[PDB]
Structure 1
Amino acid sequence: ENLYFQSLMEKAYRIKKNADFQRIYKKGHSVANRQFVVYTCNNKEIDHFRLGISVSKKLGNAVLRNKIKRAIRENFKVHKSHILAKDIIVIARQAAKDMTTLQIQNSLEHVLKIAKVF
């Protein structure tokens, strides 16, 4: 269906509130590979995963930041059906910029396996 209704459903899988980010940083578990830090945390009110993304401004220019965000969202679309019901924050590290599009997907899958979400 259309872009409006796609966005209706997909908004539920996104973490928007700064309060949620900060709760997850304080209460969640963290792991990291060279390209990504990942925090995960249970949300008792929610029975499906949610994703929040952080790409620092230090990483580079807007085109690059948007490329990294896109690659993360794309990976979660590929695996939507089998991500455990956790709130998840993905933080791109400086080194994510040094990877190709294929590499960054593999790196994401690896880190998310370490984080035990799957």
Structure 2
Amino acid sequence: MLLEKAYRIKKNADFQRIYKKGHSVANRQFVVYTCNNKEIDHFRLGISVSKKLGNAVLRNKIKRAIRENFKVHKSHILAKDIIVIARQPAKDMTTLQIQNSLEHVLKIAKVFNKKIK
């Protein structure tokens, strides 16, 4: 009795949804798009970056550091379309900062039942 990719995004509609009427934010160099504060049953996790960021190593760190966080916050995120896009200057960030990004942008997304300290 578990969930599937339901809490994932591999389509366009799933990516357009949030971008549709979803409520996107942005900290400093990271933005998170979400929809329906709580009208789903799986936190549609998604990953997006910019084309100005820099190299693939930049579009990766922003991903990895993210794929490393959401992993722990996996059981901290609730259903309500959740995504994290890299502004552009987030390239300067690292697996240390990139993670410290969700500590805000994400904290704003509202994809946290409360947000542990």
Q: Under a length normalisation based on structure 1, what TM-score does the superposition of the two structures give? A: 0.80
Query: How many Å separate the matches in 1 of 2:81 and 2:93?
Result: 26
Shift of 1:89: 2.0
Query: How many Å separate the matches in 1 of 2:110 and 2:14?
Result: 20
Shift of 1:95: 1.6
Query: How many Å separate the matches in 1 of 2:37 and 2:25?
Result: 18
Matched, 1:102 2:96: yes
Worse-superposed segment, 83-92 or 9-18? 9-18
Worse-superposed segment, 29-38 or 8-17? 8-17
Matched, 1:83 2:77: yes
Query: How many Å separate the matches in 2 of 1:9 and 1:107?
Result: 27
User: 1:72 matched to which residue of 2?
Assistant: 66
Name the CA shift for 1:29/1:43 in 2 (closer, same or farther; >3 Å): closer
Q: Under a length normalisation based on structure 2, what TM-score does the superposition of the two structures give? A: 0.81
Shift of 1:28: 0.6
1:24-82 per-position Cα deviation (integer Å, ceiling 9, x unaligned): 10111111111111110139884121211111222111222122111111110011112
Name the CA shift for 1:93/1:113 in 2 (closer, same or farther; >3 Å): same
Q: CA RMSD in A?
A: 2.3
Worse-superposed segment, 81-90 or 36-45? 36-45
Residue pair 2:6, 2:42 contacting (<8 A) in 1 also:
no
Query: How many Å separate the matches in 2 of 1:110 and 1:44?
Result: 20
Q: Which blocks of at least 5 consecutive residues in structure 1 are unaligned?
A: 1-7
Larger strand proportion, structure 1 or 2? 1
Residue pair 2:65, 2:94 contacting (<8 A) in 1 also:
no
What percent of counterpart residues are identical? 98
How many residues are matched?
111
Q: Which protein has the larger Cα radius of gyration, Structure 1 or Structure 2?
A: 1
Q: Which blocks of at least 5 consecutive residues in structure 2 are unaligned?
A: 113-117
1:65-106 per-position Cα deviation (integer Å, ceiling 9, x unaligned): 122111111110011112111111211011211123222211
Larger helix proportion, structure 1 or 2? 1
